[PDB]
């Protein structure tokens, strides 16, 4: 929507305009691309900090936020499930969520497509994430692969383990997906497990 | 009957919970001597899992009653079930060695059938006795180890077939060989190797792997609890 | 093998959940032509209940898959042939138990409590037969079921207390037959209301050994009416 | 104990002695027999009334209750289940208990051994009761019935009504269990539809 696109350039301007033309066919409107871009840039830090804290957003922050929300509308299915990785140091939103149960990050969920994140060092938490409501944003800014999920996106903790290094290794799946998601038809049955 | 007609009969027998029929259909598909599809393999396994499983439960039941004054037919009955069980195992083991294991092309499939070979040799050794027992137990350990070696070299530590093997082989060590030491060793390793490389998880079978990893974790915490000790208290 | 050995084998089979074996043992005990005890009767019934029951479930499953398919090809053709295989098995089980009833069980029955049980049983398996039967053969089984049930129902009415679990059990099964088989919700709800009302009217007749049996069946009768009745309302005050 | 036996006589007290024809080797002590007797006589009405409402018991009522509660702790579960009958006019404690659930009458539960009670007229509630913790007070000084203790929890196995008003129940003493009124594999052997 232009009202948002204009309001965006009025506050960030040069930084906002920068991201226009960074998509092959372009499913997202000029306003949405800019908000996602501005997030991926440097605003992700302060914006999520504000959402998580429950703090009252800036004009430009509310702008980026509704710009993202708009793009996160219809982008659910997205027929395929995607594997992404996220690391945290000194606190994770999902530490509050016990295994089998659901919870969410009050900020937007940034997860990289690169498995390097899962094998990165000196982390607090390392989590492999499965979901489809995410938005592929990488290539846009400022380097060269990452999927980002909506604020307050409820996730089920499928597995948690505090390894021989104090690091929590988790498996997160998007709550929506179901109970039959992640299972290869009757292979568990065919494996004749002891249990 | 054509291969397709058989597979369809098998699927219907599964639904109808006519496992003897299901086993019969899939045995015939296997006996056509062709590289079974993963769906075909699964059908065969699920069928025989249920045919042998029934006899295992009856055995355990009758064997439990044997513990608790003309219990001559109790023994006879256990022995009737014992006979059935062996014939089932010898049916699936012939299928494995003659068709399934040689026809396996991809290591994923070879590991499955070798896991299977140790599984049914374990079922055999549960009712076997004397020198015959020490053979089955060894045949089990050989099949399970052969698969374990192929899995460690060709599959990711999160693979459901690799993890499934880990659980079953670990259970074999605990239950059959009576080595809680080797059982926990296998399970801790397999679990730890999988959590270390959680990025290797497949988007099609991730909840399969996590589930098995949970069963490994559960077994480990149970088994270590059964093997405590002494001393300063 | 001795009668006692066979009953032990049947009791073992039951525990092992090897019903085919359980039925085999009890068939042989019955075939010894001597009046079954209540324990023997129970064993025979529980065994055959489970042997025929398996095929009934298998039938219902396949018949449903066979009527919920768009695959107007081989997949449905398989369904029918398989349904017919189970149909064949089911009939063989029913004839086997019906022969046992008519040849041994019903004539050997001394106490009316036992005679009603075996006649109830005779209706029960004729109803099982009727569920899969077709044409003129179907109309025979349905009427044979009814005859056996009604014959049992008169004796229970004249010889058993309205709270008797065997009388109440017959009540429920005969009422289910009318609903499911004859497709008469009227006659179904008639039998059920009556049987239930008779029993609540004479709750003092309850046996201290089988009272929770009686109450349980009365609950199932009450449930059936309150259901069969909600599915058949026939009213519009907008006249 | 004699402390209660003596207390009962220097109070009620010629009415108390009455129920003592000696025996001499009964299951219940002189004190207990008197208490149960005095209940069965005329004190059942006023005693239960105060128990059900809350009202502090009269010096005499306290002792009857004392003697009664003592006899129940001496007898308790009597291995075989009895069938007894109970009537109500103007409300029943078990009306508050829905089917399958347990509840109790805050007073003592008097039940007659005569099935005439179950087929009696002008009733609010009619209940056939199955228990073991009861006490036969017909074999005691005259006359036929079985008493269950105060606050005895009972499971409502069945309830129905009517053409019109009177509700009929099946009560089983909570303690008895789950396997209590079932004849070994009969239900299974009846191959019911459900």
Mutate to test the interface with C, among B6, B12, B54 (most CBs of C within 10 A): B12
Residue C4 class from Cβ within 10 Å (0-12 exposed, 13-18 middle, 19+ buried)? exposed
- Contacts for B189 with CB less than 8 Å, ≥ 6 apart: B166
Smallest Cα–Cα separation from D160: which of C223, C4, B67?
C223
- Contacts for D25 with CB less than 8 Å, ≥ 6 apart: none
Token pair listed for C92: 């063989």
| CB-based burial, D21-47: b 16+ in 10 Å, e otherwise | eeeeeeebbbbbbbbbbbbbbebbeeb
Which among C46, C165, C203 is the nearest to D168, CB-wise? C203
Cα–Cα distance list, C128 to A53, C44, C101, C135, C189 (Å): 67, 17, 15, 15, 21
CB D19 within 8 A of CB D5: no
In whole angstroms, what is the distance from residue C125 CA to residue C173 CA? 11
CB A72 within 8 A of CB A100: no
Q: Report which DSSP code applies to D12.
A: S
The CA-CA-CA angle for residues B169, B173, B178, to 5°, reads 160
Which among C15, C16, C61 is the nearest to B16, CB-wise? C61
Smallest Cα–Cα separation from D75: which of D8, D6, D4, D139?
D139
In whole angstroms, what is the distance from residue B53 CA to residue B40 CA? 20
CB D21 within 8 A of CB D28: no
In whole angstroms, what is the distance from residue C105 CA to residue C91 CA? 19
| CB-based burial, C14-37: b 16+ in 10 Å, e otherwise | bebebbebbbbbbbebbeeeeebe
Please give the residue of chain C at the shortest CA–CA distance from B60: C16
- Does the beta-carbon distance from C203 to D172 stay under 8 Å? no
- Does the beta-carbon distance from C17 to B62 stay under 8 Å? no
CB D135 within 8 A of CB D71: yes
Smallest Cα–Cα separation from C167: which of C156, C176, C154?
C156
Residue B178 class from Cβ within 10 Å (0-12 exposed, 13-18 middle, 19+ buried)? exposed
Q: Are strands D167-173 and A109-112 parallel, antiparallel or unpaired?
A: unpaired
Other Cβ atoms less than 10 A from the Cβ of B60: the count is: 13
Cα–Cα distance list, C96 to B176, C92, C100, C105, C122 (Å): 44, 6, 6, 12, 12
The CA-CA-CA angle for residues B184, B186, B191, to 5°, reads 90
Which among D83, D130, D187 is the nearest to C213, CB-wise? D187
Which among C200, C212, C220 is the nearest to D192, CB-wise? C220
- Contacts for B69 with CB less than 8 Å, ≥ 6 apart: none
In whole angstroms, what is the distance from residue B194 CA to residue B211 CA? 12
**Which H, E and C letters describe chain B, residue by residue?**
CCHHHHHHHHHHHHHHCCHHHHHHHHHHHHCCCCCCCHHHHHHHHHHHHHHHHHHHHHHHHHHHHHHCCCCHHHHHHHHHHHHHHHHHHHHHHHHHHHHHHHHCCCHHHHHHHHHHHHHHHHHHHHHCCCHHHHHHHHHHHHHHHHHHHHHHHHCCCCCHHHHHHHHHHHHHHHHCCCCHHHHHHHHHHHHHHHHHCHHHCCCCCHHHHHHHHHHHHHHHHHHHHCCCCCCCC
Polymer length of chain C: 239
**Cα–chain center distance at D118:** 15
In whole angstroms, what is the distance from residue A189 CA to residue B19 CA? 14
Q: In which order are the strands placed within the sheet that holds A125-131?
A: A102-104, A154-161, A168-174, A125-131, A82-88, A109-112, A146-149, A135-136
Coil vs helix vs strand at C130: helix
Q: Which helix (H) or strand (E) holds D135?
A: strand D135-136
Selected residues 56-95 of chain B with any CB under 8 Å from a CB in chain A: none
Q: Does C216 touch chain D (CB under 8 A)?
A: yes
Smallest Cα–Cα separation from B99: which of B201, B185, B30, B173?
B30
With contact defined as 3+ CB pairs under 8 Å, the chains touching D are C
Q: Give C-chain residues touching B17 at CB under 8 angstroms.
A: 54, 57-58, 61
The CA-CA-CA angle for residues B160, B164, B169, to 5°, reads 150
Smallest Cα–Cα separation from A67: which of A16, A129, A131, A125?
A16
**Structural domains of chain B, with CATH:** 1-233 (1.20.190.20)
- Does the beta-carbon distance from B119 to A192 stay under 8 Å? yes
In whole angstroms, what is the distance from residue D93 CA to residue D70 CA? 24
Is the bond leading into D24 cis (omega within 30 degrees of zero)?
Answer: yes
- Does the beta-carbon distance from A191 to B206 stay under 8 Å? no
Long-range contact pairs involving C63-72 (C-beta distance under 8 Å, separation at least 24): C65/B12, C65/B15
The minimum CA-CA distance between C236 and chain D, rounded to whole Å, is: 25
Which residues are bridge partners to A88 per DSSP? A125
The CA-CA-CA angle for residues D103, D109, D114, to 5°, reads 120
Please give the residue of chain C at the shortest CA–CA distance from D99: C219
In whole angstroms, what is the distance from residue B84 CA to residue B79 CA? 9
Q: Which helix (H) or strand (E) holds C44?
A: helix C38-65
Is the bond leading into D8 cis (omega within 30 degrees of zero)?
Answer: no
Token pair listed for C112: 């009316």
With contact defined as 3+ CB pairs under 8 Å, the chains touching A are B
| Unique residue bearing structure tokens 């052997």 | D189
- Contacts for B37 with CB less than 8 Å, ≥ 6 apart: none
Smallest Cα–Cα separation from B30: which of B88, B103, B116, B90?
B103
The minimum CA-CA distance between C78 and chain B, rounded to whole Å, is: 7
Resolution of this entry, Å: 3.2
Asked if D touches B (at least 3 Cβ pairs < 8 angstroms), the answer reads: no
Q: Give C-chain residues touching B3 at CB under 8 angstroms.
A: none
Q: Are strands A146-149 and A109-112 parallel, antiparallel or unpaired?
A: antiparallel
In whole angstroms, what is the distance from residue B166 CA to residue B162 CA? 6
In whole angstroms, what is the distance from residue D169 CA to residue D190 CA? 24
Query: In this structure, what are the phi and psi dihedrals at residue D124, rounded to the nearest 5 degrees?
Result: -95, -50
Q: Give C-chain residues touching B62 at CB under 8 angstroms.
A: 12, 15-16
CA quadruple B25, B31, B34, B37: dihedral, nearest 10: 30
Residue A124 class from Cβ within 10 Å (0-12 exposed, 13-18 middle, 19+ buried)? middle
Token pair listed for B31: 């006996």
Token pair listed for C116: 């009603």
The minimum CA-CA distance between B87 and chain A, rounded to whole Å, is: 19
Q: Report which DSSP code applies to D58.
A: P
CB C217 within 8 A of CB C171: yes
In whole angstroms, what is the distance from residue D120 CA to residue C203 CA? 12
In whole angstroms, what is the distance from residue B54 CA to residue B84 CA? 10
- Contacts for C4 with CB less than 8 Å, ≥ 6 apart: none
In whole angstroms, what is the distance from residue C165 CA to residue C212 CA? 9
Query: In this structure, what are the phi and psi dihedrals at residue C18, rounded to the nearest 5 degrees?
Result: -115, 75
| Unique residue bearing structure tokens 């089979």 | C13
Smallest Cα–Cα separation from A12: which of A20, A23, A21?
A20
Q: Give B-chain residues touching A81 at CB under 8 angstroms.
A: 203
Q: Give C-chain residues touching B68 at CB under 8 angstroms.
A: none
CB D133 within 8 A of CB D149: yes
CB B108 within 8 A of CB B163: no
Domain ranges of chain A: 1-195
Q: Rg of the Cα trace of chain A?
A: 18
Other Cβ atoms less than 10 A from the Cβ of C7: the count is: 18
CA quadruple B119, B123, B126, B128: dihedral, nearest 10: -110
**Which H, E and C letters describe chain A, residue by residue?**
CHHHHHHHHHHCCHHHHCCCCCCCCCCCCHHHHHHHHHHHHHHHHHHHHHHHHCCCCCHHHHHHHHHHHHHCCCCCCCCCCEEEEEEECCCCHHHCCCCCCEEECCCCEEEECCCCCCCCCCCCEEEEEEECCCEECCCCCCCCCEEEECCCCEEEEEEEECCCCCCEEEEEEEHHHCCCCCCCCCHHHHCCCCC
Q: Which helix (H) or strand (E) holds C143?
A: helix C136-159
Residue C39 class from Cβ within 10 Å (0-12 exposed, 13-18 middle, 19+ buried)? middle
Alpha helices in D18-157 (DSSP H): 30-38, 44-53, 59-75
| CB-based burial, A82-118: b 16+ in 10 Å, e otherwise | bbbbbbbeeebbbeebeeeeebbbebbbbbbbebebb
Smallest Cα–Cα separation from D75: which of D137, D24, D4, D130?
D137
In whole angstroms, what is the distance from residue C219 CA to residue C204 CA? 17
Query: In this structure, what are the phi and psi dihedrals at residue D88, rounded to the nearest 5 degrees?
Result: -145, 140
Other Cβ atoms less than 10 A from the Cβ of A144: the count is: 5
**Sign of the dihedral through C-alpha C172, C178, C180, C181:** positive
Indicate which technique resolved this structure.
X-ray
Residues in chain C after which the chain is broken, C→N over 2.5 Å = none
The minimum CA-CA distance between C237 and chain B, rounded to whole Å, is: 47
CB C123 within 8 A of CB C50: no
In whole angstroms, what is the distance from residue A105 CA to residue A134 CA? 14
């Amino acid at each position: 929507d232009k009202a948002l696109a204009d309001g965006l350039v009025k506050r960030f301007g040069a930084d906002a305009e920068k991201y226009l033309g960074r998509q092959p066919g372009g499913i997202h409107s000029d306003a949405e691309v800019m908000a996602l871009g501005l997030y991926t840039g440097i605003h992700y830090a302060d914006l999520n900090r504000a959402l998580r804290q429950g703090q009252e957003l800036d004009a430009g922050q509310k702008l980026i936020d509704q710009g993202m929300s708009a793009a996160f509308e219809k982008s659910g299915q997205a027929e395929q499930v995607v594997k992404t990785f996220r690391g945290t140091r000194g606190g994770d939103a999902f530490n509050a969520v016990e295994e089998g149960k659901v919870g969410h990050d009050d900020g937007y969920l940034s997860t990289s497509l690169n498995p390097g994140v899962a094998r990165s060092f000196g982390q607090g938490t390392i989590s492999t994430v499965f979901g489809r409501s995410g938005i592929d944003v990488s290539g846009i800014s400022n380097y060269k692969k990452a999927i980002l999920y909506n604020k307050e996106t409820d996730m089920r903790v499928l597995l948690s383990a505090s390894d021989e290094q104090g690091v929590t290794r988790r498996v997160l799946e998007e709550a929506a997906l179901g109970e039959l998601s992640g299972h290869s038809q009757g292979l568990l049955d065919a494996l004749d497990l002891a249990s | 009957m054509d291969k397709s007609e058989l597979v369809q009969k098998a699927k219907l027998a599964e639904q109808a919970e006519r496992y003897d029929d299901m086993a019969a259909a899939m045995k015939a598909v296997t006996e056509q001597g062709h590289e079974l599809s993963n769906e075909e393999r699964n059908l065969l396994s699920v069928a025989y899992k249920n045919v042998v499983g029934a006899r295992r439960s009856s055995w355990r039941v009758i064997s439990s009653i044997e513990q608790k004054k003309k219990q001559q037919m109790g023994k006879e009955y256990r022995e009737k079930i014992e006979a059935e069980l062996q014939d089932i195992c010898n049916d699936v083991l012939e299928l494995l060695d003659k068709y399934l294991i040689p026809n396996a092309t991809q290591p994923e499939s070879k590991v499955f059938y070798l896991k299977m070979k140790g599984d049914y040799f374990r079922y055999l050794s549960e009712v076997a006795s004397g020198d015959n027992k020490q053979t089955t137990v060894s045949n089990s350990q050989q099949a399970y180890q052969e698969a374990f070696e192929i899995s460690k070299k060709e599959m990711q530590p999160t693979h459901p077939i690799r993890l499934g093997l880990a659980l079953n082989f670990s259970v074999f060590y605990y239950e059959i060989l009576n080595s809680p030491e080797k059982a926990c060793s296998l399970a801790k390793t397999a679990f730890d190797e999988a959590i270390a490389e959680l990025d290797t998880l497949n988007e099609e079978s991730y909840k399969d792997s996590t589930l098995i990893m949970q069963l490994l974790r559960d077994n480990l915490t149970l088994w270590t609890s059964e093997n405590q000790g002494d001393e300063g208290e």
